Amino acid sequence: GKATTEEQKLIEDVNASFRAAMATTANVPPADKYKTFEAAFTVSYKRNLADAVSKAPQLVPKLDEVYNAAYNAADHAAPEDKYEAFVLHFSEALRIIAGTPEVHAVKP
Ligand SMILES: [Zn+2]
Ligand SMILES: [Zn+2]
Ligand SMILES: [Zn+2]
């Protein structure tokens, strides 16, 4: 119904902002990619999360879990591995909360 349609729109907006944050690392040296990504990611994610609080507060604990999964995987990774650890767990956890059965990326 209306709630699931609004949740899906928010999940899509979160993913699009996440992809835009990844784009900011294109021409950044490896050791600076995670800090660059994280600064870009936090601005747009916080705006998306506040939209969820307003329009679909039932989604907020699920979004919190996706972010925690990603931030915590990056937190424990060695510096050279932090960016890919975030990206991998954020994208997989977002597909899990969205109910997408193919969670590990399938190559085209
Ligand atoms: Zn930890
Ligand atoms: Zn398959
Ligand atoms: Zn996987």
Author numbering: 2 to 109
Please share text taken word for word from the publication where this structure appeared.
We used the grass pollen allergen Phl p 6, which is a small globular protein of 11.8 kD that can be easily expressed in E. coli and is a known inducer of TH2 responses. We selected single point mutations that either stabilized or destabilized Phl p 6 without changing immunodominant T cell epitopes or the overall structure of the protein. Using these mutant proteins, we investigated the effect of fold-stability on antigen processing and presentation, as well as on immunogenicity and immune polarization in vitro and in vivo.
In mutant S46Y, a buried polar amino acid was replaced by a hydrophobic amino acid. Such replacements have been referred to as “hydrophobic core packing” and reported to have stabilizing effects on the protein structure by increasing the overall hydrophobicity within the protein core. As predicted by MAESTRO, mutants E39L, N16M, and S46Y displayed an increased thermal stability compared to the WT protein (ΔT +8.8 to +14°C) whereas the destabilized mutant L89G was less heat stable (ΔT −5°C). A more detailed analysis with X-ray crystallography of mutant S46Y showed that the 3-dimensional structure was remarkably similar to that of the WT protein. The superimposition of the crystal structures of S46Y with Phl p 6 WT revealed that the overall fold is identical, with a total root-mean-square deviation of 0.42 A. As shown in Figure 5, the introduction of Tyr46 in the α2 helix, pointing into the central hydrophobic cavity, contributes to hydrophobic interactions with Phe42 within the α2 helix (and also Tyr68 in the neighboring α3 helix). In contrast, E39L and S46Y clearly showed delayed proteolytic processing, with S46Y being the most stable protein. We found that peptide 92–106 was much faster and more efficiently processed from L89G compared to the WT, whereas presentation was almost abrogated in the most rigid mutant S46Y. Despite the much slower protein degradation in vitro, S46Y turned out to be significantly more immunogenic in terms of IgG2a induction, while IgG1 levels, serum and cell bound IgE remained unaltered.
